[PDB]
Amino acid sequence: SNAVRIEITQGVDSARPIGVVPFKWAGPGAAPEDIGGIVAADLRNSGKFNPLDRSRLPQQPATAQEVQPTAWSALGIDAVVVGQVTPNPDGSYNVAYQLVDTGGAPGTVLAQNSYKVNKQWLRYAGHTASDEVFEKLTGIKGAFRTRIAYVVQTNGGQFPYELRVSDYDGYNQFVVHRSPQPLMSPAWSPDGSKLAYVTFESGRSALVIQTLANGAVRQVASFPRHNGAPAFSPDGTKLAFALSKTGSLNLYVMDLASGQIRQITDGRSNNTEPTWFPDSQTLAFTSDQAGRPQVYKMNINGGAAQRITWEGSQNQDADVSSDGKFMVMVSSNNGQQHIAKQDLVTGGVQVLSSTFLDETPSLAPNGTMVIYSSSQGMGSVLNLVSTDGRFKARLPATDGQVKSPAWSPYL
């Protein structure tokens, strides 16, 4: 199934032109998929390419040698993707692509690969070709094999809330957990094998970690009042989260090997929404110690908290990039609530989104794209915005109200 579907609302008119030719299907009858279409959709979804419309291709070469570079260079296109899909006698498929230069080294094969995959993984093969083309031309690792987690409120009676996972483009959706009560704040382990989330099934909040492959569930915390806002450390050793049992929200860290929980804040201010820096020892977090929520930074091993958001009436729910050079967050000014980016090297802030009641932003693992949600009151949709603010897309769920996204790590 694929309930979440990307609808581009603001394309990048000047994005790098590229030719993506339909792949040559070697079997009988109709091709099982349209791999060239997946590659073009992935490169367009990144906000960094403008694949030529299939109806305007100057030729449809089935091999690298058939590419006529002058036909593409004449259109301002300096690279062309061609490919082949062949059924194997064992019932599997070989999905091959070649990236051909049509610029300064016309006809040269810049990159190529061939993937032996079972039917279930044909989309994954297409995404692998996209990832290689994207990285070969931009020097940035591709995110097309990644997944998203999100919560859908269906129209159903007994278990209306569903924590789900899908590919980043909505395909291959599956249900992680269904509940009569709201599910909130999913967070990925860095190896992509587990999701921490908050459940209200007992009637009050409980933080749990579910292993996706086998559905195993580990209880973390169910103390009185609020338990939530989980974040896994990048090194795989710790889970940070917030508990308000002390009359005020404090940050806690659980050592995943021992299950031991340590309290790392114990002041009067509410401290919540932890997000890790790449070192697995520094956290950004939300605090009300300056009145309206702002984002602070602290080392889990001791030392004072440092305020880092000095611009704007209110800032919260941060997500620090995988490289630690910037973060995205929810910035509120003049009654407007939008996704913003703060450069942690230059200190500057840029508002990225223009939708209504924007919340819970999550960065793709290459730092190029943000997934977030926008509340409609009763309803909700997901949205995408590039970290440079030029690309925008909306991500509604066909079967319900969707919110609380989290972008997976590289898979």
Closer residue to K ion, CB minimum distance, 305 or 395: 305
Distances (CA, A) of 197 to 127, 253, 404: 28, 15, 10
Nearest approach in angstroms of CB 245 to K ion is: 10
324-332 long-range contacts (CB < 8 A, ≥24 apart) are: 324/277, 324/278, 324/279, 325/367, 326/367, 326/387, 327/275, 327/284, 327/295, 328/352, 328/361, 328/363, 328/370, 328/387, 329/295, 329/361, 330/358, 330/359, 330/360, 330/361, 332/292
Which residue stretch of 140-148, 244-252, 256-264, 340-348 sits at the interface with K ion (rule: CB under 5 A)? 244-252
Closer residue to K ion, CB minimum distance, 56 or 268: 268
Helices 122-138 and 35-45 pack at an angle, to 10 degrees, of 50
Q: What part of residues 27-56 is at the interface with K ion (CB under 5 A)?
A: none
What are the structure tokens assigned to 197, written together? 């989330």
The reply on whether position 286 binds K ion by CB under 5 A is: no
Nearest approach in angstroms of CB 312 to K ion is: 23
Nearest approach in angstroms of CB 288 to K ion is: 9
Distance CA 113, CA 109 (A): 11
Nearest approach in angstroms of CB 267 to K ion is: 5
What dihedral do alpha carbons 404, 350, 365, 308 form, nearest 10°? Answer: -80
DSSP 351: E
Closer residue to K ion, CB minimum distance, 187 or 264: 264
Nearest approach in angstroms of CB 307 to K ion is: 16
Which residue stretch of 4-12, 101-109, 110-118, 246-254 sits at the interface with K ion (rule: CB under 5 A)? 246-254
Closer residue to K ion, CB minimum distance, 180 or 267: 267
Nearest approach in angstroms of CB 202 to K ion is: 24
Question: Amino acid identity of 145?
Answer: R
C-beta of residue 100 within 8 angstroms of C-beta of residue 109: yes
- Give every strand in the sheet of 369-375, ordered side by side: 7-10, 392-395, 380-386, 369-375, 358-363
Nearest approach in angstroms of CB 122 to K ion is: 51
Which residue stretch of 260-268, 332-340, 375-383, 384-392 sits at the interface with K ion (rule: CB under 5 A)? 260-268
Distance CA 194, CA 37 (A): 31
Nearest approach in angstroms of CB 344 to K ion is: 24
Which residue stretch of 123-131, 208-216, 266-274, 399-407 sits at the interface with K ion (rule: CB under 5 A)? 266-274
Nearest approach in angstroms of CB 266 to K ion is: 6
Residue with smallest beta-carbon separation from K ion: 248
Nearest approach in angstroms of CB 152 to K ion is: 33
Using only the alpha carbons of the chain, give its radius of gyration. 23
Which residue stretch of 104-112, 153-161, 245-253, 280-288 sits at the interface with K ion (rule: CB under 5 A)? 245-253
Q: How far is CA 57 from the centre of its chain?
A: 31
The reply on whether position 248 binds K ion by CB under 5 A is: yes
* Contacting residue, 250, 275, 286, 386, with K ion by CB under 5 A: 250
Which residue stretch of 2-10, 242-250, 295-303, 344-352 sits at the interface with K ion (rule: CB under 5 A)? 242-250
Closer residue to K ion, CB minimum distance, 113 or 269: 269
* Phi/psi of residue 94, nearest 5 degrees: -110, 120
What is the rounded end-to-end Cα distance, in angstroms, of the chain?
Answer: 20
Which residue stretch of 248-256, 296-304, 333-341, 387-395 sits at the interface with K ion (rule: CB under 5 A)? 248-256
The reply on whether position 113 binds K ion by CB under 5 A is: no
C-beta of residue 123 within 8 angstroms of C-beta of residue 171: yes
Q: How far is CA 367 from the centre of its chain?
A: 9
Number of residues that bind K ion (CB under 5 A): 3
Closer residue to K ion, CB minimum distance, 179 or 289: 289
List residues binding K ion (CB under 5 A): 248, 250, 267
